[PDB]
């Protein structure tokens, strides 16, 4: 009876509002979908505990009073980016980059699993770890290799699921992500491709760049609020470094600058084996001649060979892949970037 009276006390065409701020005096400020902001009153059955600046409520047409709080799948944008399942092969997938493995193991696993080296002496663990170098030098493969061998949760951010146009959704998901990093295990914040948001620190007069500079400043603020973080590890990765934010390269925030130099033909032979593993590799093919001839090719190129080797088998209606397919895939696919070398001059 009483539930039906209050459900019929408000108006029926309830309008979807937007909270902006809260004053604790039975009224608040809200925002319509057209951006018109209305100094309206709030009721008392509205369950004043979940009211947060940035949520949505229900409004009236007559007085636009706050009818009730609105759910929004509670956060659709921090539960998608969280990894639940297992990544790729742990340590045997990569090869030749074992110089940098001691860096990332002692900076991540050693503050967590054995936090006694830091207590015998009194040396604090590092927070920021930067991965830069050539474009596609094996930064994605390395980040999944470290995240497999873990005992804590892991976070995977694309970098383009951070910038919206709602003027508050930028700095909102920073607190949404770090709360998930706080409520769960001391996870690894992996926000990939931070170069599109953080560069050169420019301020303009339009309403296009203002959603970037605040969110850049609020993330730098929320990373180093210096109140209680609970040993959050942050891995940041871009390709380039020279058009990036200089005040994150300075000490006090990040003291690890890990570079990934170019590999050799030694690391290739596993990558040829790994890519030619989940296929019908016939026993009449040769891969070692394909390694010896070509002297510049990456993991994307070998995978582009393996798909072209897979396509040529399906054209003439076969199941396995013959050796001439691998030869013709080596001579068709790999002829796109071979340009520029000083041969016959150097010794």
């Amino acid at each position: 009876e009483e539930r039906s009276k209050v459900d019929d006390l408000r108006g029926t065409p309830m309008s979807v509002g937007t909270l902006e701020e809260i004053i604790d005096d039975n009224h608040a400020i809200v925002s319509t979908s057209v951006g018109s902001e209305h100094y309206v009153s709030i009721l008392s059955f509205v369950d004043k505990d979940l009211l947060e600046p940035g949520c949505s409520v229900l409004l009236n047409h007559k007085v636009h009073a706050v009818i009730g709080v609105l759910m929004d799948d509670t956060d659709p944008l921090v539960t998608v980016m969280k990894v639940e399942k297992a990544p790729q092969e742990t340590y045997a997938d990569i090869g030749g980059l074992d110089n940098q493995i001691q860096e990332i193991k002692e900076s991540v696993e050693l503050p967590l699993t054995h936090p006694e080296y830091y207590e015998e002496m009194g040396i604090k663990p590092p927070k920021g770890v930067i991965l830069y170098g050539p474009p596609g030098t094996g930064k994605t493969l390395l980040a999944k290799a470290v995240a497999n061998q873990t005992s804590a949760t892991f976070l995977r951010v694309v970098g383009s699921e951070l910038i919206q146009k709602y003027l508050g959704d930028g700095p909102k998901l920073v607190r949404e992500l770090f709360r998930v990093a706080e409520e769960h295990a001391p996870s690894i914040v992996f926000i990939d491709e931070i170069d599109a948001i953080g560069t050169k620190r420019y301020d303009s007069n339009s309403g296009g760049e203002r959603e970037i500079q605040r969110t850049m400043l609020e993330l730098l603020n929320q990373l180093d609020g210096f109140d209680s973080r609970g040993d959050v590890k942050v891995i940041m990765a871009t390709n380039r470094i020279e058009t990036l934010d200089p005040a994150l390269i300075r000490p006090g925030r990040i003291d690890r600058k890990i570079e990934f130099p170019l590999p050799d033909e030694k690391t290739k032979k596993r990558i040829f084996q790994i890519h030619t593993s989940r296929m019908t590799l016939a026993d009449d093919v040769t891969l070692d001649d394909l390694i010896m001839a070509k002297d510049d090719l990456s993991g994307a190129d070998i995978k582009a060979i393996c798909t072209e080797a897979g396509l040529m088998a399906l054209r003439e209606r076969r199941m396995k892949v013959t050796n001439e397919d691998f030869k013709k895939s080596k001579e068709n696919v790999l002829y796109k970037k071979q340009e520029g070398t000083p041969e016959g001059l150097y010794l």
Partner: protein, 50 residues
């Protein structure tokens, strides 16, 4: 001709694109020039209209 004229003297109807909504006789309609609205269903239609 009177039947066409009596329904003619009547205001227009809106349109709203709905992909999904909630149950309990309240659906979620988003109009084009404005935002979303929590509205009520009719008695001539059902509820399973998501």
């Amino acid at each position: 001709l009177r039947e066409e004229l009596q329904l003619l003297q009547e205001q227009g109807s809106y349109v709203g694109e709905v992909v999904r909504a909630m149950d309990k006789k309240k659906v979620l309609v988003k109009v084009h020039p404005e935002g979303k609205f929590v509205v009520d269903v009719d008695k001539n239609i059902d509820i399973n209209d998501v």
